[PDB]
Design a protein around this ligand. Structure first.
Ligand code: A1EF9
Ligand code: ZN
Ligand code: ZN
Lengths: 101, 1275, 41, 28
C-alpha cells in the first residue's frame, strides 16, 4: 500500500493528503531521540570526555570533596599531566573510589 | 482630581524603544542600536512631515538645553544601559543632596538619644525568659551604634543620590501634569561638586566632571535604580550587623564586585550569566550527592552553557573562562547547607534587561510552526490508561458500578466481565489489551455548576480592540498613517457590568452553534511582562470579550467537575526528578488532544466544545503590541494581509500558556503511569510554580546499607527516566536531557528548597523589600509604618535575629516619620504644623515609639516577635507601653495622656465591622475607604441580570438598622455581631464589593462620572494633616486620672479605656467577651542544665511547659448531602445560639438568607452548651510534654483562655534561639521549663442566659429572589 | 470461525472509528455526534 | 477460513502500527 518505510513498512498518513513532505526525505525520515548512552556524558549519569568542562568539573569535585588539602594538591599535581580519554576515565574511577572511601 | 500622586515603585517592563523615541524627539545624539528600524524610520518620516503637539513643544527645549551645556566638556560620551550599570551604582555627590543629609543626620541623633534605653529594655525582656543575664556582648555595640553602621556602608551615597532625584522628579510631575497652571518655565541645569542633573518632565540627564561620561534615563530607570540601591543597602546592613552571616558577607561582596565588572564590557547578554544563578546553585548542592555517579551531572551542562555564551559573545580566549570558573567555584562551594540556598534571594538584585519586541515573538513563531510525528500505538495506550482512570474515579462514590457509563463492542470477555459484575481494574489490563477501549462511547452524567459565584468574571484583566480596528492601542505619532478610533472599552469589569442581557448558557450555546468560528470581531494580542531576567523572557495574552468569557466558563467547568477525579521486611526509597515546564504549551497538538477532548464532550453533554482552542486559532493571526513598537505598515489593512514576520504569528497550532491549563494537567498523567508500568515502579507527581517534580519509589529489603539503598534508587530511576523520555518523544513532547536534574536528596518548591526532610530557606529575601513608601494611591505614613513591620515580622521567622530586627524597625520608623514630615511633595503640610513638630524632639520620638492601636505610629509590638498572632491588640500595646515606661524609655505623663485622650465620632456599624479597635479620631486607611466609596456606586447602578435587586438606594439604611438591632442590648457583644453581619446578606454585599477591586483608572473614571462629592474630595486630600494634629494634641494634653495606678494590670486597664473612650453608645452598659491576657507578660522561663535546681519552678510556681532535647550531634545532616450556599444558615444559627423566643428572629434572618422551614433548620443545626509549624530545624529533636500544664483558670471544657499553641510556639522559639550559632548541640542534654501565672488577668465572668431583644426588628419587606444570593428554592 | 471473523471486523471498525476522531474532520460530522442534546435546558 | 483469518490478522497488525504527520500551516 506504501513504499518500504522503516519492520521496513510503517505506513503514515498526514492530517491531509499532501503534508508529509517535511519528513519523507528530510532512510532520512526523522532525527529521532539520540540514544541515551552510559558512555556519552548525559544528565542521567556523569562520565568524562575530552572537553574542558570535564576537567573543570573534575577539579570542582576534588575541591568540594571532604578530602584533605595536602591530598587535594597531590591529585592536582597528578592530574595536570594526564591526557587521554581512557586514562582520564580510569583516574576518574580511582578518584570516585578514594572519595567514597 | 488632584488626589492621584504618581507611582512610587517600578511596575512596568523596561523597553529600549521608549527612551529611543524620547531622545529622537529631543534630537539628541545617542548610541543605542535597534534590531527593527521601524520605529526610528517612522518617527523620522513623521517629524520630516512636521507634525507636532504640546508634548514635542515641551521636549524640544530640554534637548536644546542639553545641546547648549554639552560644549563645556568636549570629550563626552553616552554610555547605554546597562553597559553603564557599573558607574551608576557608585555615583555620589555631597553637595547636590544637602537637605536630606541634615534630615537623616537629625534622625540618627534622635535614635542615638535612646538606643541605650532600647537596649536596656530588650535585655530585660530577654533575661525575663531565663536565657541568661546578658546577651552576647558582641551584640550590644551593634544595637547601640546601629545608625553609625548604616551610615558607614558603601551604598549610602548612591542611595541618597537616587532618592533625592526620585523625589524631585515626582514633585515636578505631580505639580505640572495638573492643568491648574498651564504656563511653565523650563528647569535649569543644576550644578554641584561632581555631578550636574537636568530633570525634564520625562527624562533625566547626568553629566559627571572627571569622567565626562553622559547618562540619559527615564522615570522607570530612576525608580528601578532607587529600588535596587535601597535593597542593597538594607541587605548589606542586615548582614554586617549580624554575626551568623560572616562568610556569606564576603561571598556576596565578591559576587557583586565581580559581576559588576563584566557589565562595561559584556553588555546586555550579561543577564544570561545572571539568570544562570539558580541552576548553578542546584548543581553545587548536588555535588554532595551520596551516589558518586551523579556528582557533576548537572554541573557539566551548566559549565557547557557558560562556555557557550562566552564563546558566542566573543571572548574567544580561554584564560578568562578558567578564571571565571575559579571565581564561581570560590563563590558557591561552601560547607553549610542552610547557607547554600541563601544566594537564591540576591538573584534579582542586579537590575533588569532592556527587552525589545521583535526578539520575543521571534522565539514562539519558530517554536510553533514545526511538523511532528506521533505513534498511534503509544497514543492509544495512553488513551486506554486515561479511560481506565476515569472508570475508577466514577466507580468510587457509587457503590462500585458503571451505570451511566460506556458500552464496549468487541472487548475481551475479561474486561467485559468487570463492567458486568462491578469490580475495578488497574493499568495492567488496559495497557495489556488497549484494543478493547478502541471504540467506546460514553454518556453524559455530570451537571454544569453554573451559578456558584461571581469571582472569575470579576477578576480584573485586560481586553483587546475589535478585529477590524486593531490599530487603536498605538498613539497617533508613532505610525505612518492616522489610526482609527477604538470604541470598545478595555475594562473587563466595566464591560461586564454595563451590559443589559447576560446568561452563561448563551455563551456555551454560542460556542456549540459554531458561531465563534465566524464571529467577525474576535481578536487576540500579546504584551510583554515586567520584572523578568531573560531577553526572550515571556509574554501574556489578552483577547475579546465573548471568547474570554467562554474560555473562563469552560475552565471553571472542567476544574469544578471531572478535575476532582485525578486529585489522588521491605520498605520504600525514592529519588527525585526535577524539570522545567516553560515552552511546553507550545508543543501540544490537535492530534494528541482530540481523544480526551472528545471524551469530555461525551461526559459533559456539550457536543464538540472542549477542543475550541486550536479549532479557532488555526485561522486567526496573533501579534505582540506595545505602545512603542509600531508595525511597519503603509495604511490600515485587515488582520490577514499582514506578512508573517517580525511582530506577528500567523496560523499557529500550539496552545497559549495559562489557557485550558487543567485540561493539559489532567491529560498528561496517563503517560507518566504508562512509563511507570513499563519500568515496574510506582511514581508520584507535583507541579509547583514553573517546574514539574516527580518522585519515583521502589521497594527494597529492610536490613541493608543505607548507601546501598540510595544507590538502588538512582539505578532504578535512570532506566525510568530513559523510558519516559523515549515515550514522550514518541508522543511529541521532547523532554530535554540537560535541563532536568536527577537527585537522591532534594527537590525545589515554593516555600523553600526542601532537602532530605529539613527545609533550607532564604531569610534575606524580604528584608530587601522594606522601603520608604508603601504602594497606594496617596502615600500615607500609617500605611508605610505597617508595610515596614510586616516585612520585618516575615524576615524574622525565616532565620534572622529578633532583637536586631526590632531595632532596625524602630530606626526605619523614626527615619520615615522625618521624611513624611519634612521632605515630601504633599501640599497640605502648612508651616504652622510643620514647625511646631520639628522644633521639639521628645514629642516626636514619643509619637514614633507609641504603638498604633493606642494612638501612636508604631505597628510592631514585642509579643509579635515570637508568636504569630497576638491576643488582644489593645491590651498587648498597653502592656508594651507599661514595659517601656518601666525601662524608662518614656515619661510618666504619657500613660495618663493616653487614658484621658479625647474620643472620636464613630457609627454603630463600624463597631461591628471591626470588633477590636477602641476607635480614635481619623485612624482609617484612605485607599481602603476610597475603594468602598467608589465601588458602591457602580455596584448599585448596574442593570446586570445577575445582581438585580441586590442593591437598592437604601442599602446603608437597612445595614445600620440591622446592625443596631443586633448590637443594642443591655450587654454588647461585638464578636457575634461581626460574624453574623458578615454571614448575612449585608456581609455578602460587602464581600462582593471588596472582591471587586479598583485602580487609578477606574477611580478616575468614576470621578469623571461624578460619583464623589467635592466635599469628600477635600476631606480626603486634607487627611494626613489630621493624624498629626491629633497626635500633637494627645501628646500635649495635660490631664490625670486618680484611679490609674500603673500597677493595675493590662486587662483591667483596657476595659476602663474602652468604656471611657466609646461610652457615648455604651451609656454605662458593659462590654464583654473581647480581651485575653498578653503572652509576654505572664510567662517566665528557666534553662535546666544537667546538675542544678529550678528556682522559678520551686519558689511556688507549679504549672509549666516542659521541653527536652538530648545531646544529639546534628544541624549537619541525618436530608443534607454535599451542601451548597445554604451552609451559612447553620453557622449563623449556631452563632445566634439557643434562645427560646429569639428562635423566631433567628429563623427569620435564616429565611431571608434562603428558603428553609423552622423544623428543617432546627433539625439540621447542631447544638452545643455555648451560644458564643515547620519553619525551624531544632524542633525535630525535642520532646514536648504538657504534664503540668492542665492548671488553667477553672480548668473547663471551654476554649483555651491562654492559647496553649502560643505557649508551645514561644517555647520552641526560645529553644531555637538558644542554638542559633553552634553547629553541634553541645556536651549534655538540655531541659527547659516555661511557667505561666495569670491570676491578675482573671475575668469574673457572669454568663447571662441571653440578651433579650430590645428593639422592634425590621427587615426588607420582600425577600430577595436573586439567583446568586443564597437559594430561595434549595429543596 | 465466523465469530472470530466478526470480532476481527469489530476491531477494525473500532480502529477506524477512533482514527476518525483524531485525524480530524474529513467526513460529514465525525467530530462529536454521539453526545446527548444537553443535560439542562 | 485459515488463510482468511491470517490475512485479516496481518492487516490488523499493519493498521496497528501507523504514524501521524502534522503540517505547519493553518489553511495551506
Ligand atoms: C505533557 N507533559 N508532560 C509533562 C511531564 F514532564 F511532567 F511529564 C508535562 C507536560 C505538560 O505539558 N505540562 C504543562 C502543564 C501546564 C501548562 S500551562 O500552560 O497551563 N502553564 C505554563 C507552564 C507552567 C504551568 C502553567 C503556568 C501558567 N500560569 C499562568 C498564570 O497563572 C498561573 C499559571 C503547560 C504545560
Ligand atoms: Zn521550672
Ligand atoms: Zn492580669
Amino acid at each position: 500500500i506504501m513504499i518500504a518505510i522503516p519492520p521496513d513498512l510503517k505506513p503514515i498518513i498526514g492530517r491531509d493528503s499532501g503534508r508529509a513532505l517535511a519528513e519523507v526525505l528530510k532512510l532520512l525520515k526523522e532525527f529521532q531521540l539520540k540514544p541515551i548512552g552510559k558512555k556519552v556524558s548525559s544528565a542521567v549519569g556523569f562520565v568524562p570526555d575530552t572537553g574542558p568542562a570535564s576537567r573543570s568539573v573534575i577539579r570542582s569535585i576534588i575541591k568540594s570533596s571532604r578530602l584533605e588539602e595536602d591530598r587535594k594538591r597531590y591529585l592536582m599535581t597528578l592530574l595536570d599531566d594526564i591526557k587521554g580519554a581512557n586514562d582520564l576515565a580510569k583516574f576518574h574511577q580511582m578518584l570516585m573510589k578514594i572519595i567514597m572511601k | 482630581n488632584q488626589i492621584l500622586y504618581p507611582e512610587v515603585h517600578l511596575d512596568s517592563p523596561i523597553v529600549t524603544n521608549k527612551i529611543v523615541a524620547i531622545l529622537e524627539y529631543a534630537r539628541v545624539p545617542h548610541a543605542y542600536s535597534l534590531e527593527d528600524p521601524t520605529l526610528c524610520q517612522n518617527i523620522k518620516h513623521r517629524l520630516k512631515n512636521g507634525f507636532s503637539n504640546q508634548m514635542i513643544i515641551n521636549n524640544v527645549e530640554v534637548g536644546n538645553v542639553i545641546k547648549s551645556k554639552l560644549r563645556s566638556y568636549p570629550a563626552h560620551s553616552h554610555i547605554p544601559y546597562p553597559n553603564c550599570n557599573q558607574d551608576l551604582f557608585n555615583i555620589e555627590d555631597k553637595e547636590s543632596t544637602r537637605k536630606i543629609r541634615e534630615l537623616l543626620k537629625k534622625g540618627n541623633s534622635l535614635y542615638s538619644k535612646v538606643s541605650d534605653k532600647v537596649f536596656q529594655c530588650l535585655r530585660d525582656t530577654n533575661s525575663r525568659l531565663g536565657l541568661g543575664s546578658e546577651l552576647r556582648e558582641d551584640i550590644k555595640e551593634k544595637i547601640i551604634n546601629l545608625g553609625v553602621y548604616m551610615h558607614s556602608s558603601q551604598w549610602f551615597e548612591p542611595f541618597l543620590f537616587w532618592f533625592t532625584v526620585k523625589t524631585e522628579m515626582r514633585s515636578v510631575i505631580k505639580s505640572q501634569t495638573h492643568t491648574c497652571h498651564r504656563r511653565r518655565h523650563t528647569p535649569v541645569f543644576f550644578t554641584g561638586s561632581s555631578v550636574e542633573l537636568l530633570i525634564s518632565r520625562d527624562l533625566v540627564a547626568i553629566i559627571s566632571k572627571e569622567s565626562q561620561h553622559v547618562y540619559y534615563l527615564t522615570f522607570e530607570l530612576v525608580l528601578m535604580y532607587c529600588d535596587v540601591i535601597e535593597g542593597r543597602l538594607m541587605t548589606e546592613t542586615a548582614m554586617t550587623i549580624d554575626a551568623r552571616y560572616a562568610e556569606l558577607l564576603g561571598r556576596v561582596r565578591y559576587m557583586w564586585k565581580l559581576i559588576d565588572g563584566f557589565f562595561p564590557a559584556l553588555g546586555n547578554p550579561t543577564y544570561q550569566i545572571v539568570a544562570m544563578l539558580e541552576p548553578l546553585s542546584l548543581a553545587y548542592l548536588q555535588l554532595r550527592d551520596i551516589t558518586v555517579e551523579l556528582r557533576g551531572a548537572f554541573l557539566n551542562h551548566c559549565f557547557t552553557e557558560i562556555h557557550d555564551v562566552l564563546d558566542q559573545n566573543g571572548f574567544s580566549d580561554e584564560g578568562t573562562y578558567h578564571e571565571l570558573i575559579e571565581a564561581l567555584d570560590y563563590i558557591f562551594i561552601t560547607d553549610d547547607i542552610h547557607l547554600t540556598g541563601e544566594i537564591f534571594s540576591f538573584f534579582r538584585s542586579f537590575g533588569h534587561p532592556r527587552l525589545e519586541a521583535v526578539t520575543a515573538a521571534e522565539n514562539v513563531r519558530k517554536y510553533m510552526n514545526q511538523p511532528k510525528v506521533i505513534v498511534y500505538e503509544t497514543l492509544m495506550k495512553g488513551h486506554a490508561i486515561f479511560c481506565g482512570i476515569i472508570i475508577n474515579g466514577y466507580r468510587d462514590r457509587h457503590g462500585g458500578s458503571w451505570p451511566p457509563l460506556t458500552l464496549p463492542l468487541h472487548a475481551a470477555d475479561t474486561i467485559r466481565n468487570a463492567q458486568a459484575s462491578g469490580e475495578g481494574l488497574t493499568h495492567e489490563q488496559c495497557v495489556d489489551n488497549w484494543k478493547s477501549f478502541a471504540g467506546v462511547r460514553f454518556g453524559c452524567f455530570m451537571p454544569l455548576s453554573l451559578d456558584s459565584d461571581l469571582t472569575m468574571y470579576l477578576k480584573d484583566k485586560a481586553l483587546a480592540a475589535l478585529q477590524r480596528e486593531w490599530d487603536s492601542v498605538y498613539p497617533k505619532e508613532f505610525l505612518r498613517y492616522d489610526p482609527p478610533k477604538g470604541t470598545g472599552s478595555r475594562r473587563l469589569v466595566d464591560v461586564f457590568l454595563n451590559d443589559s442581557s447576560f446568561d452563561p448558557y448563551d455563551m456555551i450555546m454560542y460556542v456549540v452553534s459554531g458561531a465563534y468560528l465566524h464571529d467577525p470581531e474576535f481578536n487576540l494580542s500579546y504584551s510583554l511582562k515586567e520584572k523578568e531576567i531573560k531577553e526572550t523572557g515571556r509574554l501574556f495574552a489578552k483577547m475579546t470579550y465573548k471568547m474570554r468569557a467562554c474560555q473562563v466558563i469552560a475552565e471553571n467547568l472542567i476544574s469544578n467537575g471531572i478535575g476532582k477525579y485525578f486529585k489522588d521486611t521491605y520498605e520504600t526509597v525514592s529519588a527525585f526528578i526535577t524539570t522545567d515546564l516553560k515552552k511546553y504549551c507550545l508543543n501540544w497538538r490537535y492530534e494528541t488532544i482530540s481523544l480526551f477532548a472528545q471524551r469530555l464532550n461525551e461526559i459533559y453533554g456539550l457536543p464538540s466544545f472542549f477542543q475550541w482552542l486550536h479549532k479557532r486559532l488555526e485561522t486567526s493571526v496573533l501579534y505582540v503590541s506595545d505602545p512603542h513598537c509600531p508595525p511597519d505598515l503603509d495604511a490600515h489593512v485587515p488582520l490577514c494581509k499582514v506578512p508573517n514576520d517580525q511582530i506577528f504569528i500567523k496560523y499557529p497550532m500550539g496552545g497559549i500558556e495559562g489557557y485550558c491549563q487543567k485540561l493539559w494537567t489532567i491529560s498528561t498523567i496517563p503517560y507518566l503511569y504508562l512509563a511507570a508500568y513499563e519500568s515496574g515502579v510506582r511514581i508520584a507527581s507535583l507541579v509547583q510554580g514553573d517546574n514539574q517534580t516527580i518522585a519515583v519509589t521502589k521497594r527494597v529489603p529492610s536490613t541493608w546499607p543505607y548507601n546501598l539503598k540510595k544507590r538502588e534508587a538512582a539505578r532504578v530511576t535512570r532506566d525510568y527516566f530513559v523510558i519516559l523520555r523515549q515515550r514522550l518523544h514518541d508522543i511529541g513532547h521532547h523532554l530535554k536531557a540537560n535541563e532536568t536534574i536527577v537527585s537522591s536528596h532534594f527537590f525545589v518548591y515554593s516555600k523553600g528548597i526542601y532537602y532530605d526532610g529539613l527545609l533550607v530557606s532564604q531569610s534575606l529575601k524580604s528584608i530587601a523589600r522594606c522601603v520608604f513608601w508603601s504602594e497606594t494611591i496617596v502615600d500615607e505614613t500609617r500605611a508605610a509604618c505597617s508595610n515596614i513591620a510586616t516585612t520585618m515580622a516575615k524576615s524574622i521567622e525565616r532565620g534572622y535575629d529578633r532583637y536586631l530586627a526590632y531595632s532596625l524597625n524602630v530606626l526605619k520608623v523614626i527615619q520615615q516619620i522625618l521624611i513624611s514630615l519634612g521632605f515630601t511633595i504633599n501640599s497640605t503640610m502648612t508651616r504652622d504644623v510643620v514647625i511646631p513638630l520639628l522644633t521639639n524632639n521628645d514629642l516626636l520620638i514619643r509619637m514614633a515609639l507609641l504603638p498604633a492601636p493606642i494612638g501612636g505610629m508604631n505597628y510592631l509590638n514585642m509579643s509579635r516577635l515570637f508568636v504569630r498572632n497576638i491576643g488582644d491588640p489593645v491590651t498587648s500595646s498597653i502592656a508594651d507601653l507599661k514595659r517601656m515606661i518601666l525601662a524608662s524609655l518614656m515619661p510618666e505623663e504619657t500613660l495618663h495622656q493616653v487614658m484621658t485622650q479625647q474620643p472620636g465620632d464613630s457609627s454603630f456599624l463600624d463597631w461591628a465591622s471591626d470588633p477590636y479597635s477602641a476607635n480614635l479620631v481619623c485612624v482609617q486607611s484612605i485607599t481602603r475607604l476610597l475603594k468602598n466609596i467608589t465601588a458602591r456606586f457602580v455596584l448599585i447602578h448596574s442593570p446586570n441580570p445577575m445582581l438585580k435587586g441586590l442593591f437598592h438606594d437604601d442599602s446603608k439604611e437597612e445595614d445600620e438598622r440591622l446592625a443596631a438591632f443586633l448590637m443594642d442590648r443591655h450587654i454588647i457583644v461585638p464578636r457575634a455581631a461581626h460574624e453574623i453581619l458578615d454571614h448575612s446578606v449585608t456581609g455578602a454585599r460587602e464581600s462582593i464589593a471588596g472582591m471587586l477591586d479598583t485602580t487609578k483608572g477606574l477611580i478616575r473614571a468614576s470621578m469623571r462620572k461624578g460619583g464623589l462629592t467635592s466635599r469628600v474630595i477635600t476631606r480626603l486630600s486634607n487627611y494626613d494633616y489630621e493624624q498629626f494634629r491629633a497626635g500633637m494634641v494627645l501628646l500635649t494634653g495635660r490631664k490625670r486620672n486618680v484611679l490609674i495606678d500603673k500597677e493595675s494590670c493590662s486587662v483591667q486597664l483596657a476595659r476602663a479605656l474602652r468604656s471611657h473612650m466609646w461610652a457615648r453608645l455604651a451609656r454605662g452598659r458593659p462590654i464583654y467577651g473581647l480581651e485575653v491576657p498578653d503572652v509576654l507578660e505572664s510567662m517566665r522561663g528557666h534553662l535546666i542544665r544537667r546538675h542544678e535546681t529550678c528556682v522559678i519552678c520551686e519558689c511556688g510556681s507549679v504549672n509549666y511547659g516542659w521541653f527536652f532535647v538530648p545531646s544529639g550531634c546534628q544541624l549537619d545532616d541525618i436530608s443534607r448531602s454535599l451542601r451548597s450556599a445554604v451552609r451559612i444558615a447553620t453557622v449563623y444559627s449556631w452563632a445566634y445560639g439557643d434562645d427560646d423566643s429569639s428562635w423566631n428572629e433567628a429563623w427569620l434572618l435564616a429565611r431571608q438568607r434562603a428558603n428553609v422551614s423552622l423544623e428543617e433548620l432546627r433539625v439540621i443545626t447542631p447544638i452545643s452548651t455555648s451560644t458564643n509549624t515547620s519553619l525551624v530545624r531544632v524542633a525535630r529533636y525535642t520532646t514536648i510534654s504538657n504534664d503540668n500544664l492542665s492548671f488553667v483558670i477553672s480548668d473547663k471544657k471551654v476554649d483555651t483562655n491562654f492559647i496553649y499553641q502560643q505557649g508551645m510556639l514561644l517555647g520552641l522559639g526560645v529553644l531555637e534561639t538558644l542554638f542559633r550559632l553552634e553547629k553541634d548541640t553541645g556536651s549534655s542534654n538540655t531541659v527547659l521549663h516555661l511557667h505561666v501565672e495569670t491570676d491578675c488577668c482573671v475575668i469574673p465572668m457572669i454568663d447571662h442566659p441571653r440578651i433579650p431583644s430590645s428593639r422592634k426588628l425590621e427587615l426588607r419587606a420582600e425577600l430577595c429572589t436573586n439567583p446568586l444570593i443564597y437559594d430561595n428554592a434549595p429543596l
